[PDB]
Amino acid sequence: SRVAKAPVVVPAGVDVKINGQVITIKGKNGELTRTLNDAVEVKHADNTLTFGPRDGYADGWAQAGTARALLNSMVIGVTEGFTKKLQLVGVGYRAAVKGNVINLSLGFSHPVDHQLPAGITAECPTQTEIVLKGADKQVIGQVAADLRAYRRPEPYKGKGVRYADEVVRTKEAKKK
RNA sequence: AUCACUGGUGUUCGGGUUGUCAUGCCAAUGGCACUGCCCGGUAGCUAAAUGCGGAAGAGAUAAGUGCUGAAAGCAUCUAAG
Numbered sequence A: 001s002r003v004a005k006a007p008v009v010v011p012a013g014v015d016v017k018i019n020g021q022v023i024t025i026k027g028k029n030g031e032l033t034r035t036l037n038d039a040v041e042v043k044h045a046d047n048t049l050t051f052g053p054r055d056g057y058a059d060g061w062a063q064a065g066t067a068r069a070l071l072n073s074m075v076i077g078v079t080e081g082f083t084k085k086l087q088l089v090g091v092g093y094r095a096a097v098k099g100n101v102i103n104l105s106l107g108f109s110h111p112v113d114h115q116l117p118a119g120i121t122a123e124c125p126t127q128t129e130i131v132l133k134g135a136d137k138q139v140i141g142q143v144a145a146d147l148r149a150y151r152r153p154e155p156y157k158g159k160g161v162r163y164a165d166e167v168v169r170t171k172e173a174k175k176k
Numbered sequence B: 001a002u003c004a005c006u007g008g009u010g011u012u013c014g015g016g017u018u019g020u021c022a023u024g025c026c027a028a029u030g031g032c033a034c035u036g037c038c039c040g041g042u043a044g045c046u047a048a049a050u051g052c053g054g055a056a057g058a059g060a061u062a063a064g065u066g067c068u069g070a071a072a073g074c075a076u077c078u079a080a081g
Ligand SMILES: [K+]
Pocket: B003
């Protein structure tokens, strides 16, 4: 509703294309396409997209609000792009990128190699930092979640793979 | 599952031996006595013998964990995906 009302602006250089429900956004950072829910009517208008419910759908305003938030992320994706940062905490925990495969040393008796998906790249500044980059906000979120899952932050020392902007509450071992 | 090995059985293979009857007798043999009683043992069957098995992988999930995400300007694993 309120989210669906605010239209999204197409900055210069971004080219939208609507084939019924299938949309395609093309920018300097790549090309993203989505099939919108059959209850959403989207209009290109004058360098600004608008979103509204179609007639005969009881949830059109809920479906238009999500279609708006996604297309707004698609436009940001093909220009500024998205970035996620992860830190490793713990003596001996290290990371390193070789091609599109991240090598994790997380205290296991075996190595952890994580293959990145199609349009995601990863740089390791220090050995305890990973920086992901990509145009798809959902994909970069999934990749970061998969890397965090190898060694979730534990509550007694905060050790593991954490999001850089993550608050990790710790607690003290029970006395006696 | 199998019998190469280790073994059991092995009244159809060989031997020892008690009592008695017979083959004229000696010598040699056979019958009967739980296979007379025993000692070994071939093939076969067999276990205690010795080979092998339970999986890996894949698909769709349970509880559970998430990503993106509005309805509800926030939040939200869910309503779409
Ligand atoms: K045998």
